[PDB]
Amino acid sequence: TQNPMVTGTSVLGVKFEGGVVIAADMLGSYGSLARFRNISRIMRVNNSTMLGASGDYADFQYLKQVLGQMVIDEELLGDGHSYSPRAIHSWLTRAMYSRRSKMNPLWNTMVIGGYADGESFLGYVDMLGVAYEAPSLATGYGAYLAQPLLREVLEKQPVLSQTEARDLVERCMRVLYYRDARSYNRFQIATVTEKGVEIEGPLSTETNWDIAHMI
Amino acid sequence: AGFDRHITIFSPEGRLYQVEYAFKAINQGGLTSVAVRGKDCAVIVTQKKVPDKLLDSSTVTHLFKITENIGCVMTGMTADSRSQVQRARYEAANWKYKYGYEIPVDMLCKRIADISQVYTQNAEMRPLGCCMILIGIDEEQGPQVYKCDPAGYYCGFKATAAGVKQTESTSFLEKKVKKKFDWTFEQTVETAITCLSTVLSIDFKPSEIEVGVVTVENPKFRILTEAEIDAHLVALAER
Amino acid sequence: TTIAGVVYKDGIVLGADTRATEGMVVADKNCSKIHFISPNIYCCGAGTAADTDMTTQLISSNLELHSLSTGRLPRVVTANRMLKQMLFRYQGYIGAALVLGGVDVTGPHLYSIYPHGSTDKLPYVTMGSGSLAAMAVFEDKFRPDMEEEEAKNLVSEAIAAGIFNDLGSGSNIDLCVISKNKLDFLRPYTVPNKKGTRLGRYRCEKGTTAVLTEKITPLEIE
Amino acid sequence: TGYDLSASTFSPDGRVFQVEYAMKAVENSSTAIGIRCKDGVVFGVEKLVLSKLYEEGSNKRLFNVDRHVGMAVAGLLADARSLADIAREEASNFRSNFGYNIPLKHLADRVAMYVHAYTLYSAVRPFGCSFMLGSYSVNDGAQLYMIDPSGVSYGYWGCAIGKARQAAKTEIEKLQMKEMTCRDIVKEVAKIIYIVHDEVKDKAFELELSWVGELTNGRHEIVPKDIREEAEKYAKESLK
Amino acid sequence: SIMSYNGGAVMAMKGKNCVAIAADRRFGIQAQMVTTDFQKIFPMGDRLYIGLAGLATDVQTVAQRLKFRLNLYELKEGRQIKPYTLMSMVANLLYEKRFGPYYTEPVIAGLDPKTFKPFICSLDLIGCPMVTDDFVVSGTCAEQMYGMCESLWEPNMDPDHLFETISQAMLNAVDRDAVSGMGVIVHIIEKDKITTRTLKARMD
Amino acid sequence: TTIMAVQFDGGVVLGADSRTTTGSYIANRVTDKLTPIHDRIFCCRSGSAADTQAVADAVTYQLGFHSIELNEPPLVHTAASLFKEMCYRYREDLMAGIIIAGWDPQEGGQVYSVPMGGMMVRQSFAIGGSGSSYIYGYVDATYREGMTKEECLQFTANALALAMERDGSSGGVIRLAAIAESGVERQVLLGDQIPKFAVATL
Amino acid sequence: RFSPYVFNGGTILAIAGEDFAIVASDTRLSEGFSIHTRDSPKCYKLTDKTVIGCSGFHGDCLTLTKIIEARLKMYKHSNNKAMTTGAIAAMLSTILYSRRFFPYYVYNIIGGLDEEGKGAVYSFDPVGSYQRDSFKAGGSASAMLQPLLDNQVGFKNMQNVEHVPLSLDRAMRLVKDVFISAAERDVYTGDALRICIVTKEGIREETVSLRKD
Amino acid sequence: FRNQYDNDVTVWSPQGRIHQIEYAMEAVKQGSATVGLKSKTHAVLVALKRAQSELAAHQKKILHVDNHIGISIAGLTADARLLCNFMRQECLDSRFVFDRPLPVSRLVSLIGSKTQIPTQRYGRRPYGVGLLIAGYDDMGPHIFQTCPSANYFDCRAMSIGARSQSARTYLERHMSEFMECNLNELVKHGLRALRETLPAEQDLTTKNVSIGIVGKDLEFTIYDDDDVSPFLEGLEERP
Amino acid sequence: IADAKTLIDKARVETQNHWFTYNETMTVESVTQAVSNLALQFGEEDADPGAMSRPFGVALLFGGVDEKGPQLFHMDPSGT
């Protein structure tokens, strides 16, 4: 996609003890028009991994199709091996970089989140293919707004509990609705735990509009 | 000798023996197919033999639909037959895409037949051992029946047969066309069933025969249901 | 270039101007813009002239192989599809805008094919620089189920409107009438405008032009 | 007689012998059976244990060709693994382009066409593997399809491939499978597999059972060891 | 324009049972004349001539290429090309490079091999054929020449009259264009003979 | 162009304006943008006419071949996926927005929207084309779940009319189609039949 | 429109020694004004005797490290020996030039022990020019860090001062200090410093904390 | 006669056997024996190398594909070198693309696919190297053997090569003990099993034995001439 | 002699290619492996047209001083 078309903004993830939670708005906006409002930007790659994407929905839909088949193929092989969250991240990094090299970039910037072998993994892959792993990740304008709130809680307390983490993502999603135009109220939250990946359905944010009367 | 054994080599008397050997394969199957053209309808009847009770009867068919309005019965090696049907279906669609109108039956036989000549002239491949009979309605020329053989010959016939009893079947049909009475849909179907039955001496039951019909009133190829086949069979016995 | 076509009760009448202009000078008058695709299909072309001539010719040729093999007169749709797909692949680089008209077993069909591969089956179509002017005449007077003579008049009036109103078009009007039974290619259907008499004779008498050198080589007629 | 040397050649009597010779290969392999019942399709393979050294649960002759379809193979194993790969690729493509799980009847046809191609050309030998594919989809139903080395594909209510195909068919024939449910069939498949195995010629066999159906939620899966064990016991008792 | 870089003028005219093709003789790079003898009219037959004006390189290449095609055609068919056929063969050569066009506008003038009917035609860069019963002009000075030709040409002109009309038209026209000129060659083709005369012109 | 599809229980009503425009000239005032990809799957085409017409024909070819080989009526989702791949693979070269709607026995009436760029989203009601922007409000407010087929025909007509008046590119007659198990009923609304909404008239 | 590169920032330093080689780097990856991560060490251990440090577009650094790692394995399989530091440098030079036309935006420093057992630092331009250099600083703060190392390590512009061979201890002290200075004045560098000391025993990784912005 | 049917891999024999593939299988027997065994924590390959002459060094029978996988060749060395390169590149590829050591089982599937293509197509000869592949992956220690025929098997233990039946016999009797064995015990059991293959006059020496060990904590290591001395010294004397 | 000339040439290029890529001198063993790889190709192992179908008919003794000191490797038409 040389030019992005229908796009979505901000997927946030933080690593709780025992898993990672990633949350996303469900809006694909055609350049300032909220054209698609029930699209899901979070996918279950495998029981141990989930990926969410910010950017052209089309490129994400292609990546879901390619990645999904790659997972299905391993399962048919039935060797008991499976792709770790780290592996899916490595592949995406090579893939996004390859398209950048061919100057046919995939616009999506994605968060790979997974818990395998008792260790949580959260990683970032950009369109230009920059990849890193970190305790909390926010794509989009989230990096500018949500990441500061997430980092502060993490620096003071390095390890967080699932309840604490879900609360933080709800709070961070609230800020993004308040200060980012491309955002939408409805969001989905998905958590990888030892048990598996479960994606909660439309969850909405209570909003405080008190300052309005202050004028 | 050694004149046979490669399609390309010609016999000292110019006979391309391998192509002739292929026509023998159609007979090895042991099944016969008869097609007759009526004033308003074209019917293809073939013998359905199910070797084992376990095999699902629905899956075994020699009647395939090349396109909504063209139907074919392929006699010969089963695998080769399916291969040709796919090529026909591809060719039929490619005509609609490129030229915008449904392929005329004659042109489908011509294309399929021409593909067979390439096999007959090129060394590596083997002539597919199957014969396809296509039935269709052309608005300009009414009902049409065409047969393409492994050689690449593509003649169109008022009535024709392929298989073990083809010669006998042709004789029976020839007598019936010579005493021409024209054929109504019922007669066209009845003539076909009587011919297959008489040549095989089978006295068929509805299960053993698969009959497919194209009519001017309903142009789409339809494979008749066992009940419909039984109705015609019952009438033949009654009269 | 005003090219226009109408569907009459039993056929199609195709009209075109006869002027080819390179830049703003009339390179030629009596240029022919109603090309022959097949006996039953004739197509009028506008846009880059070479592209129109070559594309029509390739399709005319392909349709001849097709008709010979099929053994039946070519259908108009086949002409449209072959033309559209070729144009689409070239992505508008081949700038040929054509009005394709023919009568086939299905009946009378007229199509307008824009350079990018768009096609429209329409009762009346006009294309080219004068198309807008011509369309006005058609919108005003096209009636369904017109008889052939009325149709020839409508198409003549429309090409005429383009000839006078648009700078690019201008010269004689050509009409081609395709009917199930017959085709009449009426070149010079009308000569709307004619060059005025040369009042003064400026003819040069022999010896007017000096010659430095001359060589006469005698061809051997045999 | 040079008629049998290549598949391009046709014998004077019309028979392409090389294909027939390939079909004889499947008879060399051990028997494998697939039975389709109302709920779903159960496949069973008698896997001879050639040596104690070979690991159990390995050298599998039952492959999952896609989430919803399973393949049981008999014949030269190498070709079969390769055919399985062709099938898996075809299934992936149908999902990638048409966007849904491949209908089995189509899958059988596409793989068959690939198998048939080998029959025509002289450069490549006919494949030496005969395989059965089965799937259960709520819309399609339960489907069992068997592909011969020739490329003939047909749908079988019950089917057997391998050395004891004729004997097995007789046993499968007396089953009234259409009425039977999937769990009951697993015991029955085992009984047949035990009956056909020849103890004198073949030293020992491990029954490998796989199934797809409503119970598996339309996913072909190896039968759970508890179910397999119960069936192997039912079979030995029936053998008496 | 690219066409204006080398400069040229070619004209052909149709008389009664005669054709005349005339062209300027200056070869120059932009503004500097290099040679006053460039050949822009090439014989393509006994009584058929082609005139090429445009980039000089293209004039030389298209003529050399056309001859290759023509010589083979003549050897293969054992017949001289009818004039209309050369036009078609040229149009094919030019259209083949429709993208990246050879920058030459050709004029073909000749008498039919058997009838001896006169034929004059012109083609554009991309190869569009125009057959005219009067005159055809190509080159930098086309506007100037079209005007001189429209007025002077009269139908059914005799050979001596045709030479006088073509000469007057080319001479007057190349006079009003800076990049064409420095002499004009008129070839007159009649069934019996071909007469080529070089006119006397302002060498400025 | 304004193309709109709405899914009623048991089928879909597709509708579109008839105007195709080169610049400010209306080249065709009676174009049919609702095309039959298959017997019961139709696509509304908006975007470059050339691209839409090519993709539509190529999908008709592919779906038809597939249907004959599978010997089953084709699935609307399958058609959408075929359109999605072409539109996605050639997103840079194609400028087409297609709404694919149809009835398949397996999933009933289904409306899928392929926006430019190659996304497939199933939607209860989908609006597309230049005129769609003006009617996003009418559809959001007006759409009510479980509308009857007749109610949908009116909804589609009113919506397309409102866009036609406020969009120059949209215009012409309204072409409306109802596709269901029974079959395709195609209707053209012209002149008085096109719904009219009163002007401000200050 | 699409720009294939972004400056992810970072600074890398390498100091050779008679018997030791020290390669050190920031741990902050910054795109634009934002800090992507504060824990991304830019030093990678190619072999027991060699460490590569890369700064620039991170995406190129990740690909290059993967390529060098793969090639090292291939040299081992084919030649049945480990690549020396000198060899890795030459191979990297060729790898980088391969993309002279669409370049890798990575400033790379390879530091390691040579065959003689002395410490060698090889510094490379983005297009692969390689020079063996006693000390080299690469990255956003090359400008700030290089002059200090030159005065202290190279004794340049210092008159009447004796020349003493650098010791692992003096160098660790120097590396820590130069990075502390850069954290203060280069926006890109900060968060933490990973110092990797390669000696005959092997790479040892020590992390110290520089100021978080 | 039956000389016919043995010329090419593309000709099926009248009884269903492709003879060239079988002839290729015979090649492994020509090579020196190698024994591979596994314990719950380690996988071991031991080989009996052969030398052209006293002056010449013994050939390499054990080669390292990757840190987690190593192979021992029995048969034509050339085919082995070629297959090993393919395997090494496939492993390197996985680490670059997925940053995971390739599951050992997956690699063997790939070696099988590459190996099968020569068997069905006229042209390249079937690979005639027999390979024992040993690796520790997350699933555990794994020992797999690959035939010149593409078929591959997972084994608790296996010996491929000349006089390898004798080794398989010893391995079967002492097999149960292997699962709980310590590394020294496992290599010792293996050295004894290959000893059986050796002619009675010949004895295991530091020169002719190569041991390769891969385990959860051990990267594949080929202990060679002087490093087999610890494992060999503990061994007893010929039975 | 002729097939030797090709094998000596592959060796000369491979030693030089190693200097260019790694600025070091190839060990005698690697150089033999390199020529051997060419010899092994006779089996039609690769699809490249320019590979001799016949096994090479030359045996080369390669001797050199490397990191491991004086070494002599012998190569045979098989490529071992």
UniProtKB/Swiss-Prot annotation, chain A:
Where is this protein localized, as stated in its record?
Cytoplasm; Nucleus
Q: Is Chaperone among this UniProt entry's keywords?
A: no
Parts forming coiled coils: none
Which example biological process does GO assign this protein?
proteasome-mediated ubiquitin-dependent protein catabolic process
Q: Which residues carry this modification: Phosphotyrosine?
A: 57
Which superkingdom heads the taxonomic lineage of this protein's source? Eukaryota
Q: Which GO terms describe its cellular component?
A: ciliary basal body; cytoplasm; cytosol; extracellular exosome; mitochondrion; nucleoplasm; nucleus; proteasome complex
Induction of the gene: Up-regulated in fibrolamellar carcinomas.
Q: Does the keyword Cytoplasm apply?
A: yes
Task: Recite the UniProt keywords alphabetically.
Answer: Acetylation, Cytoplasm, Disease variant, Host-virus interaction, Nucleus, Phosphoprotein, Proteasome
User: A single GO molecular function, which one?
Assistant: lipopolysaccharide binding
Could you describe the subunit structure of this protein?
The 26S proteasome consists of a 20S proteasome core and two 19S regulatory subunits. The 20S proteasome core is a barrel-shaped complex made of 28 subunits that are arranged in four stacked rings. The two outer rings are each formed by seven alpha subunits, and the two inner rings are formed by seven beta subunits. The proteolytic activity is exerted by three beta-subunits PSMB5, PSMB6 and PSMB7. Forms a ternary complex with SMAD1 and OAZ1 before PSMB4 is incorporated into the 20S proteasome. Interacts with PRPF19.
What family is this protein classified in? Belongs to the peptidase T1B family.
Q: What is this protein called?
A: Proteasome subunit beta type-4
Which residues of the whole protein does the chain here span? 46 to 260 of 264
From Swiss-Prot, chain B:
Query: Which one Pfam family would you cite for this protein?
Result: Proteasome
Phosphotyrosine-modified residues are where?
153
Q: Name one GO biological process term.
A: proteolysis involved in protein catabolic process
Intracellular or extracellular location(s): Cytoplasm; Nucleus
Q: Which domain of life is it from?
A: Eukaryota
Give the Gene Ontology MF terms in alphabetical order. Answer: endopeptidase activity; NF-kappaB binding; purine ribonucleoside triphosphate binding; RNA binding
Any keyword 4Fe-4S? no
Gene Ontology CC annotations of this record:
cilium; cytoplasm; cytosol; extracellular exosome; mitochondrion; myofibril; nuclear matrix; nucleoplasm
Chief localization = cytoplasm
- Is the keyword Hydrolase assigned to this protein? no
Q: Which CDD domains match?
A: proteasome_alpha_type_6
N6-acetyllysine, modified sites: 96, 98
Alphabetized UniProt keyword annotations:
Acetylation, Cytoplasm, Glycoprotein, Nucleus, Phosphoprotein, Proteasome
Q: Which residues carry this modification: Phosphoserine?
A: 11, 57-58
Q: Mind telling me which NCBIfam families this protein's record contains?
A: PRK03996.1
Q: PANTHER family of this UniProt entry?
A: PROTEASOME SUBUNIT ALPHA/BETA
User: Can you tell me which family this protein belongs to?
Assistant: Belongs to the peptidase T1A family.
Q: What does this protein do?
A: Component of the 20S core proteasome complex involved in the proteolytic degradation of most intracellular proteins. This complex plays numerous essential roles within the cell by associating with different regulatory particles. Associated with two 19S regulatory particles, forms the 26S proteasome and thus participates in the ATP-dependent degradation of ubiquitinated proteins.
For this entry, the protein name equals Proteasome subunit alpha type-6
Swiss-Prot record, chain D:
- Biological process GO annotation list? proteasome-mediated ubiquitin-dependent protein catabolic process
Which Gene Ontology cellular-component terms appear in the entry? cytoplasm; cytosol; extracellular exosome; nucleoplasm; nucleus; proteasome complex; proteasome core complex; proteasome core complex, alpha-subunit complex
**Name of a matching Pfam family:** Proteasome_A_N
What keywords are annotated for this sequence in UniProt?
A: Acetylation, Cytoplasm, Host-virus interaction, Nucleus, Phosphoprotein, Proteasome
| InterPro entries, per database record | Ntn_hydrolases_N (IPR029055), Proteasome_alpha (IPR050115), Proteasome_alpha-type (IPR023332), Proteasome_asu_N (IPR000426), Proteasome_sua/b (IPR001353)
Identify residues that carry N6-acetyllysine.
52, 201, 225
Where would you find the membrane-spanning parts of this chain? none
Inducing or repressing factors:
Down-regulated by antioxidants BO-653 and probucol. Up-regulated by bacterial lipopolysaccharides (LPS) and TNF.
Where does it primarily localize?
cytoplasm
Q: Which residues are recorded with the post-translational modification Phosphoserine?
A: 238
Q: Where in the cell is it found?
A: Cytoplasm; Nucleus
Sample GO molecular function, one term: ubiquitin protein ligase binding
Assembly:
The 26S proteasome consists of a 20S proteasome core and two 19S regulatory subunits. The 20S proteasome core is a barrel-shaped complex made of 28 subunits that are arranged in four stacked rings. The two outer rings are each formed by seven alpha subunits, and the two inner rings are formed by seven beta subunits. The proteolytic activity is exerted by three beta-subunits PSMB5, PSMB6 and PSMB7. Interacts with AURKB. Interacts with CDKN1A. Interacts with MDM2 and RB1. Interacts with the C-terminus of TBXA2R isoform 2. Interacts with DNAJB2.
* Similarity remark: Belongs to the peptidase T1A family.
Name of the gene encoding the protein in the UniProt record: PSMA3
Swiss-Prot record, chain G:
Pfam families associated with the record: Proteasome
List modified residues, type Phosphoserine. Answer: 34, 40, 134
Name positions with the PTM N6-acetyllysine. 176
For this chain, the annotated S-S bridges are none
Keywords attached to this Swiss-Prot or TrEMBL record, sorted alphabetically, are:
Acetylation, Cytoplasm, Deafness, Glycoprotein, Host-virus interaction, Intellectual disability, Nucleus, Phosphoprotein, Proteasome
What PROSITE patterns would the database entry show? PROTEASOME_BETA_1 (PS00854), PROTEASOME_BETA_2 (PS51476)
Q: Name one GO cellular component term.
A: extracellular exosome
> Which residues carry a glycan?
30, 181
Q: Which residues carry this modification: Phosphotyrosine?
A: 122
Q: Does the keyword Transmembrane helix apply?
A: no
Q: Oligomeric state and partners?
A: The 26S proteasome consists of a 20S proteasome core and two 19S regulatory subunits. The 20S proteasome core is a barrel-shaped complex made of 28 subunits that are arranged in four stacked rings. The two outer rings are each formed by seven alpha subunits, and the two inner rings are formed by seven beta subunits. The proteolytic activity is exerted by three beta-subunits PSMB5, PSMB6 and PSMB7. Interacts with SERPINB2. Interacts with RFPL4A. (Microbial infection) Interacts with HIV-1 protein Tat.
Report the disease annotation for this entry: Neurodevelopmental disorder with microcephaly, hypotonia, and absent language: An autosomal recessive disorder characterized by microcephaly, intellectual disability with absent speech, severe developmental delay, short stature, and hypotonia. Affected individuals also manifest aggressive behavior and have hearing loss.
The protein's name in its UniProt record = Proteasome subunit beta type-1
